[PDB]
Amino acid sequence: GPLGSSFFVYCKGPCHKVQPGKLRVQCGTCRQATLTLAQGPSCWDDVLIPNRMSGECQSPDCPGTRAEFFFKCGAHPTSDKDTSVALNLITNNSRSIPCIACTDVRNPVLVFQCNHRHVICLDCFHLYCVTRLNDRQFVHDAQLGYSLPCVAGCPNSLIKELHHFRILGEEQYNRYQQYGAEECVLQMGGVLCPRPGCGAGLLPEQGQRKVTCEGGNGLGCGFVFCRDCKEAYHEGECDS
Amino acid sequence: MQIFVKTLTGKTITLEVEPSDTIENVKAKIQDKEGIPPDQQRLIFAGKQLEDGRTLSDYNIQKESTLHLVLRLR
Amino acid sequence: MQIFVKTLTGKTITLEVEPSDTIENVKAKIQDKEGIPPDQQRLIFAGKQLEDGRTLSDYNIQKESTLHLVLR
Ligand SMILES: [Zn+2]
Ligand SMILES: [Zn+2]
Ligand SMILES: [Zn+2]
Ligand SMILES: [Zn+2]
Ligand SMILES: [Zn+2]
Ligand SMILES: [Zn+2]
């Protein structure tokens, strides 16, 4: 909910891990750090939602007023626009709440946005993300995307800032992105090409049972098949 | 900055973009290098379809992060 | 340690400072590099204008971070 110096970002290098973050702000128009804020931010929505706060750009040729917040890693000097995504669900365990998985008081921890605000440590959250990813247990929402709910199974606890899944590690994160793109195609009514090695994302018309893997140069393998059996194209008797 | 656009088949493309660039601008850069008309392009990041009016910073897409491209030929 | 000052003319000044240096000392170092007197200098960091009484450690300004200079 509220804010503070307990910011945590994911540094993609040289840290390749979750690190304490620095909150910065730039003018929403000229994209320069010359905008002053008459009041500081009070909640996460103030820094996560665009045009949620106003200020005044101190440039003589810029009347910008929109505050644009961003984050940088705080474990080492960073360039002026070397940003890192902020993990708003990760904060310091000031209440010293034990992990709901390993039953160990750790710091920092991730707090799900369920009704009970369940607490999990980063190590357990990493294992929780990997196992559900390999088991294809991730959930896809047309509004949020490819995410996971609370580890305890609470409703309406899907993680909204999908960059929290950077804890999967570099290899498993690109697999997560790939699985999300695949489930996204299936969500739009499309179908994945059954020919191994191709794995294309095809979006044919809803009525056509004919699927012509075809996009252009290297965009399709040219295999014609049926949406239902996914074996080979036919005119009838979809059974084996 | 640089971002990557990958198809589900495995083909990868590199683009020179800015965080303020819109998804519509991203699809235009794709056409300038691949000849794919933007109307047939559907960009996906972390399983979420990217709206043409939105920007990369709206999705917090960082440098050298990967966008997924699926074609819609209707 | 080093800190950076970005000006309206695009150029980035590199200053040698200590965490205990005051904002007045930093403005003096900016005059030694660009000739801008400190009465015309305004420094912006983290959406706040820096006052001449505090120090770099008072504003959590760490090594090799960037200040933004605008003229009065
Ligand atoms: Zn770092
Ligand atoms: Zn401005
Ligand atoms: Zn744990
Ligand atoms: Zn829960
Ligand atoms: Zn195919
Ligand atoms: Zn069939």
Tell me, what amino acid is at A53?
Answer: M
β-bridge pairing C41-45 and C66-71: antiparallel
Residue with tokens 């940088």: A72
Hey, which residues does A56 pair with through a beta bridge? A36
Whole-Å CA distances, A214 to A155, B65, B68: 40, 26, 17
Residue environment code for B25-54, b if the CB has 16+ CB neighbours within 10 A, otherwise e: bbbebbeeebebebebbbbbbbbbbbeeee
- Residues counted in chain B: 74
Technique of determination: X-ray
> How many Å apart are CA A240 and CA B55, to the nearest integer?
47
Provide the 8-state DSSP code for A214. -
Taking only Cα atoms into account, the Rg of chain B, rounded to an integer number of angstroms, comes to 11
CB-based contact A93:A108 (threshold 8 Å): yes
Tell me, what amino acid is at A215?
Answer: G
Q: Is C40 on the interface with A (CB under 8 A)?
A: no
Q: Is C14 on the interface with A (CB under 8 A)?
A: no
Nearest CA to A165 among A199, A130, A191, A137?
A: A130
Report the SS3 class of residue A202.
Answer: strand
Residue A93 within a domain? no
Residue with tokens 């929505």: A45
Helix (H) / strand (E) containing A36:
strand A35-36
Say what the resolution is, in angstroms: 2.5
Cβ partners under 8 Å of residue A148, min gap 6: A128, A129, A132, A137, A138, A139, A158, A159, A165
CATH at residue C24? 3.10.20.90
Q: Which of A58, A88, A118 is the last residue of a domain?
A: A88
> How many Å apart are CA B17 and CA B57, to the nearest integer?
11
Helical packing angle, A170-187 and A122-134, nearest 10°: 50
**Alpha carbon of A128 to ligand 3 centroid (Å):** 10
Q: List chains touching A (3+ CB pairs under 8 A).
A: B, C
Cβ partners under 8 Å of residue B70, min gap 6: A181, A184, A185, A190, A201, A202, A203, B7, B8, B42, B44
Residue A123 within a domain? yes
DSSP states along A76-88: S---TT---EE-T
Q: How far apart are the first and last CA of chain A?
A: 55
Range of the domain at A215: 191-240
CATH at residue A175? 3.30.40
Beta strands in C1-72 (DSSP E): 2-6, 12-16, 41-45, 48-49, 66-71
**Alpha carbon of A103 to ligand 3 centroid (Å):** 6
Judged by CB atoms closer than 8 Å, whether chains meet at A80 and C66 is answered as yes
Judged by CB atoms closer than 8 Å, whether chains meet at B47 and A31 is answered as no
Judged by CB atoms closer than 8 Å, whether chains meet at B66 and A145 is answered as no
Q: C-alpha angle with apex A176: A175 to A181, nearest 5 degrees?
A: 95
CB-based contact A160:A141 (threshold 8 Å): no
Q: List chains touching C (3+ CB pairs under 8 A).
A: A
Residue environment code for C45-67, b if the CB has 16+ CB neighbours within 10 A, otherwise e: bbbeebeeeebbeebebbeebbb
> How many Å apart are CA A5 and CA B69, to the nearest integer?
38
Q: Which of A163, A187, A211 is the last residue of a domain?
A: A187
Q: How many domains does chain C have?
A: 1
Chain C, nearest residue to A57 by Cα: C47
Q: Is C42 on the interface with A (CB under 8 A)?
A: yes
> How many Å apart are CA A222 and CA A211, to the nearest integer?
9
- Collect residues with CB below 5 Å from ion ligand 4: A 112, 114, 118, 150, 152, 154
> How many Å apart are CA C65 and CA A189, to the nearest integer?
49
User: Which residues of chain A lie closer than 8 angstroms to B7, CB-CB?
Assistant: 200-201, 215, 218-219
Compare CB distances from C65 to A34, A59, A77 and report the shortest one's residue: A77
> How many Å apart are CA A178 and CA A200, to the nearest integer?
11
In angstroms, the separation between the Cα of residue B10 and the nearest Cα of chain A is 8
> How many Å apart are CA B43 and CA A210, to the nearest integer?
24
Burial class (CB in 10 A: 0-12, 13-18, 19+), C18: exposed
Residue A220 sits in the same domain as residue A235:
yes
Q: Is A96 on the interface with B (CB under 8 A)?
A: no
Residue with tokens 């400190």: C38
Q: C-alpha angle with apex C8: A77 to A40, nearest 5 degrees?
A: 60
Q: How many domains does chain A have?
A: 3
Residue A239 within a domain? yes
Range of the domain at C65: 2-72
Residue A132 sits in the same domain as residue A178:
yes
Whole-Å CA distances, A99 to A118, A155, A180, A213, C27: 8, 19, 28, 47, 49
Judged by CB atoms closer than 8 Å, whether chains meet at A84 and B42 is answered as no
Taking only Cα atoms into account, the Rg of chain C, rounded to an integer number of angstroms, comes to 11
CB-based contact A4:A42 (threshold 8 Å): no
Tell me, what amino acid is at B62?
Answer: Q
How many C-alpha atoms does A234 have within 13 Å on its Cβ side?
10
Query: Best of C42, C68, C69 to disrupt the A interface by mutation (most A CBs within 10 Å)?
Result: C68
SS (H, E, C) B26-68: HHHHHHHHHCCCHHHEEEEECCEECCCCCECHHHCCCCCCEEE
CB-based contact B9:A199 (threshold 8 Å): yes
Residue A154 sits in the same domain as residue A226:
no
Q: Which of A166, A187, A208 is the last residue of a domain?
A: A187
> How many Å apart are CA A155 and CA C56, to the nearest integer?
47
CB-based contact A146:A163 (threshold 8 Å): no
CB-based contact A72:A9 (threshold 8 Å): yes
> How many Å apart are CA C49 and CA B7, to the nearest integer?
47
Query: Best of B3, B7, B43 to disrupt the A interface by mutation (most A CBs within 10 Å)?
Result: B7
β-bridge pairing C41-45 and B48-49: unpaired
Sign (positive/negative) of CA torsion C48, C49, C55, C56? positive
